[PDB]
Amino acid sequence: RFAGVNESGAEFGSDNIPGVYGTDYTWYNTTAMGEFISQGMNIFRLNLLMERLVPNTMTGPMNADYLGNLTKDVNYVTDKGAYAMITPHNYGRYYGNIINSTSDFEAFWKTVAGAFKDNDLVMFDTNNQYYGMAGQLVADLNQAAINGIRAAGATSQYVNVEGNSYTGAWTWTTAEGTDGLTNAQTMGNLTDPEDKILYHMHQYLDSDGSGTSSTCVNSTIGATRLMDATAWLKSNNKIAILGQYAGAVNSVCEEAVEGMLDYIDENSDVWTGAIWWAAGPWWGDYMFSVEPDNGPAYSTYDPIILEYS
């Protein structure tokens, strides 16, 4: 169903706010995403920095310039009939502080969603990879985001909710927040007036699930790492999307990736698709880059992504 790529770059140099366009961060290569769309890819997760989109205070107005760049890339993707997911890539933090005010987060999402409220090909993603946080707070922030999105009149779009502990699928039931609570203990009770919640988890295939190593543990490690989360989703009648995953260019990773995507296809009653990490124009020889012109992983995994589209 959903099959596509992350676009990463507009959130780079996150320590430099607002940062310098062309030095700290950049926006995306529409010629490259046009190739992906022409191939049949139908979703692009557009990563961005909260402090650049809504500077100084998360309840404030949106920066016209950075919003203007976001909107051009969103409209490029959606004018060509693909989904654009808007992802504040902030780990649950704003100017480095854990986001502790559900009211402020509701307001931030009301503001952002208001700019895209009539575009049904837009998807909202409450925040990338909350971590190191009270589990209850992460659930409460996801709920606040849903509230603000629908309060803006953005009623057609899926809302991607992300768990604590880097929203890892393999640790959904085991990783503990600051309050001792797991994602399984906190994220089930989310409600949406439009019933369009996607449980958005990430899954890497290396030893510690971080994706920093090119070595995938073994040929089945992806599917096996989704099994516990898939039971939680099936049992609690939720649906999900694999919003980041990757393997490097070697035979074990390629088999593990194939096997993961087959597992999601076999469990399509709960898994709606998968989004590769990552494309974007500033990755160079990054082992996971599928950017067409120079991504080391493009020629191996671009066909695999399309095979599950």
Ligand X SMILES: *[C@@H]1O[C@H](CO)[C@@H](O)[C@H](O)[C@H]1NC(C)=O
Ligand Y SMILES: OC[C@H]1O[C@@H](O[C@H]2[C@H](O)[C@H](O)[C@H](O[C@H]3[C@H](O)[C@H](O)[C@H](O[C@H]4[C@H](O)[C@H](O)[C@H](O)O[C@@H]4CO)O[C@@H]3CO)O[C@@H]2CO)[C@@H](O)[C@@H](O)[C@@H]1O
Binding site for ligand Y (CB under 6 A): 129, 165-166, 168, 171, 202, 204, 208-212
SS3 266: helix
Residue 156 carries which side chain, given as an amino acid letter? S
Provide the 10 A C-beta neighbour count for residue 219: 17
Which residue number, 168 or 247, has a Cβ lying nearer to ligand Y?
A: 168
Candidates 221, 226, 253, 305: give the one binding ligand X (CB under 6 A): 221
Q: The tokens of 207 are what?
A: 């030893």
In sequence order, the β-bridge partners of residue 123 are 85
Q: 93-94 and 97-98: which strand pairing?
A: antiparallel
Distance CA 26, CA 69 (A): 10
- Choose, by CB under 6 A, the member of 31, 103, 156, 235 that binds ligand X: 31
Does the protein bind ligand X through residue 217 (CB under 6 A)?
yes
What pairs with residue 85 in β-bridges?
A: 45, 123
Of 292, 295, 297, 302, which lies in the binding site for ligand X, with binding defined by CB under 6 A?
Answer: 292
Nearer to ligand X, 220 or 309 (CB): 220
Residues 6+ apart with CB under 8 A from 189: 139
| Residue among 201 and 270 whose Cβ is closer to ligand Y | 201
Report in angstroms how near the CB of residue 83 gets to ligand X at its nearest: 20
Tell me the C-alpha distance between 62 and 74, whole Å.
16
Numbers of helices and strands, H then E, in the chain:
9, 10
Write the DSSP symbol of residue 61.
P
User: Least distance to ligand X from the beta carbon of 119, Å?
Assistant: 16
Minimum distance between the CB of residue 143 and ligand X, rounded to whole angstroms? Answer: 6
Q: Annotate each residue in 52-91 with x if it binds ligand X (CB under 6 A) or - if it does not, as one string.
A: -------------x--xx--x-------------------
Q: Which stretch binds ligand X (CB under 6 A): 112-120, 148-156, 212-220, 227-235?
A: 212-220
Footprint on this chain of ligand X (rule: CB under 6 A): 21, 29, 31-32, 35, 65, 68-69, 72, 140, 143, 189, 191, 217-218, 220-221, 281, 292-293
